[PDB]
């Protein structure tokens, strides 16, 4: 049967996307920029959580340091502005999930409960309820108003490197180090379906905006998953690229993946076609292992990628508006077939 | 030392308390789990051993050795259905590991439930496993005296692994097989498939070259060299980039003209020579062999 | 050598150890009683014990072969020396 599928693949054509170039570089923090998150209501400013613990807010247009925020103690591993209500959630290895209010620039409510240094926060899009999960191997669910944990989605057998809150029945996509991913009947307190198509730490996951799917990463492979049924959608061509740290998808089906190699990958989300590799640069003084993109996100526009690299740099990427199907095409896509996943 | 019953009970308790305690700290030390399970086995209380294994499994499924140990423990007390059920469960959990499948297979083989081993093998092969699985299956199905249904799986073994090595292996099998008609038939099939998927959607030129060579030598053993010749012409016709192909053809010609052989082969040597840099020797060779326009053009170059 | 190969190669071996020398289903219960030869299962049990025993004694010999202080260190220096 393989030959049929392969033939079908060859028949189809992954569309051309404009490639990328390093538009802006910001040596802002004094640590790794492990978290980056961008305001989805206005597309004006984006904050980034350092290892220093001082999450700093950055205007896009200028690029300048809008303002620092330092309520945490340990590395702010993740943050998440809620477009729904003006609350910047954040989270550190100090186990706090502090909710800032940007109408005041202070912190408002802490969410105590988490046993171990929480790695990720995701706010629920259609509720006043937020999801968080860390080394505890538990994806908790906080009612914001009342600042209690409502429910605790036990299941995972190992730390839980990412999480994504969606509006549907599978309200949580929990991506763990346990070489799994879970979709949850949140109301039930049960994994509705559990995809496991990963050899290694599933340590970079992203919801697609207008598709209702979620890409996940392993050490190399980068599946993309359709979370209605709880079904696979598409294997990718990530066969030689590094350990994926972050995996932010664009609005226009332009799935990003960030390498521990340092190499910025770039995929057509629909197909899997690796339509640009880009070996990143480090700052003059750095060491060659340090060039590692540890964070990433796209704007509302989708025309600016922001990447929290370990060179203490917040690099930003434009799509080339001078590009065509002849002036910089993709990397001449070819499904390899060598006992492959495609 | 361990004389009476109640005393043995106490010993069992104490030992358990140790083992349990050590598990409590490092929930994961499968060495500690499996050791404890061995202890249970030794005690000849099977249920407790099973429980231990289950708990251990829960703690870490991915550790294959644990699974194997449990399996073999089950086998030990001739509790074969439990072993079988478990092994099925193992397969279900971790199908893409091979050793579990092989463990199952050997168990069934020793059992002499040959039908079941066929059935399971069908399943495993159906999951597009490693080539190894296919090969082992074939060996089983050859160790099984019959030579039908094997054919079908070979056909499917191409379906999962469209690799020329597969085809070649199949041909080798047919060589073992008595009826030569199918050998030629197989060759015809393979060639046809190659033709159909001509464009860049398979193996490199190498594999195809190898195939063509093999076919050519099979025919060489057989009567019809006319058809071989035709195939060669077809091959050069159907395929461009014919270094391998031409080489093979040249060899065949040499076997089975001389000027041609020296010519094309020598030219190839020049190409090879070029790749190395005896470039003078190459040019000279060309000059001698030629065509003379390409001799003087390439000479100039 | 991967655990892929070492499995199949060990599979091939124990097939040579074999080369030396019915299904009834109650679908309501789901109980698939494969009544098979009780002599062959016993022959598996004895063979499998013997295989494990052979391996068990193999370590015992290799343990009794011989810059350290205690049992573990001697081996730990042996773990360094092999490199």
């Amino acid at each position: 049967l393989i030959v049929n599928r392969y033939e079908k693949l060859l028949s189809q054509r992954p569309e051309w996307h404009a490639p990328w170039k390093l538009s802006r570089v910001i040596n802002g923090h004094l640590g790794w920029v492990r978290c980056v998150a961008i305001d989805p209501v206005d597309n004006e400013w984006f904050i980034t959580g350092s290892n220093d613990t001082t999450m700093k807010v950055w205007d896009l247009a200028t690029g300048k340091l809008k303002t620092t925020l330092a309520g945490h103690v340990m590395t702010v591993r993740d943050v998440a502005v809620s477009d729904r209500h003006p609350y910047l959630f954040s989270v550190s290895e100090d186990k706090t999930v502090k909710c800032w209010d940007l109408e005041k620039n202070q912190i408002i409510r802490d969410y105590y409960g988490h046993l171990s240094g929480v790695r990720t926060v995701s706010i629920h899009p259609t509720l006043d309820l937020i999801a968080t999960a860390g080394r505890d191997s538990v994806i908790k669910l906080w009612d914001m108003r009342t600042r209690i944990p409502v429910i605790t989605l036990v299941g995972h057998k190992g730390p839980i490197n990412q999480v994504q809150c969606t509006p549907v029945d599978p309200q949580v996509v929990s991506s763990s180090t346990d070489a799994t991913v879970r979709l949850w009947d949140v109301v039930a307190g049960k994994t509705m379906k559990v995809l496991t198509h990963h050899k290694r730490s599933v340590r970079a996951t992203a919801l697609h905006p207008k598709e209702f799917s979620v890409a996940s990463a392993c050490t190399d492979d980068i599946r993309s998953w359709g979370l209605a049924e709880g079904s696979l959608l598409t294997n990718f061509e990530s066969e030689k690229t590094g350990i994926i740290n972050t995996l932010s998808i664009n609005q226009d089906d332009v799935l990003f993946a960030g390498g521990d190699n340092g190499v910025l990958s770039f995929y057509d989300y629909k197909s899997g076609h690796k339509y640009q590799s880009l070996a990143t640069r480090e700052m003059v003084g750095s060491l060659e292992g340090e060039r590692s993109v540890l964070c990433s996100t796209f704007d509302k526009t989708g025309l600016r990628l922001i990447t929290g690299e370990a060179d203490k740099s917040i690099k930003i990427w434009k799509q080339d508006e001078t590009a065509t199907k002849e002036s910089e095409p993709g990397l001449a896509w070819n499904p390899n077939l060598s006992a492959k996943r495609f | 030392d361990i004389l009476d019953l109640e005393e043995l009970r106490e010993y069992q308790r104490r030992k358990r308390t140790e083992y349990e305690g050590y598990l409590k700290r490092n929930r994961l030390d499968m060495g500690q789990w499996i050791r404890y399970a061995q202890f249970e086995i030794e005690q000849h209380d099977m249920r407790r051993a099973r429980s231990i294994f289950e708990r251990a499994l829960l703690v870490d499924s991915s550790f294959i050795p644990l699974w194997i140990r449990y399996i073999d423990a089950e086998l030990k007390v001739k509790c074969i259905n439990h072993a079988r059920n478990l092994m099925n469960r193992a397969i279900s959990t971790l199908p893409r590991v091979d050793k579990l499948w092989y463990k199952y297979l050997i168990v069934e083989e020793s059992l002499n439930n040959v039908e079941i081993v066929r059935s399971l093998y069908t399943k495993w092969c159906s999951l597009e496993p490693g080539v190894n699985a296919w090969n082992s299956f074939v060996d089983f199905e050859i160790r099984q005296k019959n030579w039908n249904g094997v054919r079908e799986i070979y056909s499917k073994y191409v379906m999962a692994h469209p690799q020329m090595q597969t085809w070649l292996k199949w041909v080798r099998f047919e060589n073992r097989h008595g009826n030569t008609e199918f050998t030629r038939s197989v060759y015809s099939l393979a060639i046809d498939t190659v033709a159909n998927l001509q464009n860049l959607q398979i193996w490199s030129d190498m594999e195809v070259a190898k195939l063509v060579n093999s076919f050519a030598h099979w025919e060489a053993a057989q009567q019809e060299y006319e058809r071989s010749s035709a195939l060669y012409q077809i091959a050069i016709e159907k395929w461009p980039s014919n270094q391998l192909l031409k080489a093979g053809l040249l060899d065949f010609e040499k076997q089975f003209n001389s000027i041609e052989e020296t010519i094309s082969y020598k030219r190839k040597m020049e190409y090879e020579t070029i790749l190395s840099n005896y470039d003078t020797w190459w040019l000279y060779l060309d000059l001698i062999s030629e065509f003379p326009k390409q001799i003087m053009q390439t000479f100039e170059k | 050598i991967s655990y892929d190969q070492l499995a199949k190669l060990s599979y091939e071996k124990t097939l040579r150890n074999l080369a030396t020398q019915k299904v009834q289903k109650d679908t309501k219960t789901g109980k698939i009683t494969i009544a098979d030869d009780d002599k062959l299962v016993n022959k598996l049990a004895v063979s499998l014990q013997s295989e494990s025993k052979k391996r068990y004694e193999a370590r015992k010999r290799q343990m009794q072969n011989a810059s350290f202080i205690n049992d573990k260190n001697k081996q730990f220096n042996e773990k360094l020396s092999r490199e």
Binding site: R5, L9, G226, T234, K270 | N88, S119, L120, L127 | -
Partner: peptide, 25 residues
């Protein structure tokens, strides 16, 4: 007999877009 590891099956491996892109989820 068609029950050995009935939980697993190959169609879970099959990417449901690699065949048909623009499978509008």
């Amino acid at each position: 007999t068609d029950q050995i590891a009935k939980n697993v099956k190959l169609d879970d491996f099959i990417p449901k877009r690699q065949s048909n892109f623009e499978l509008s989820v």
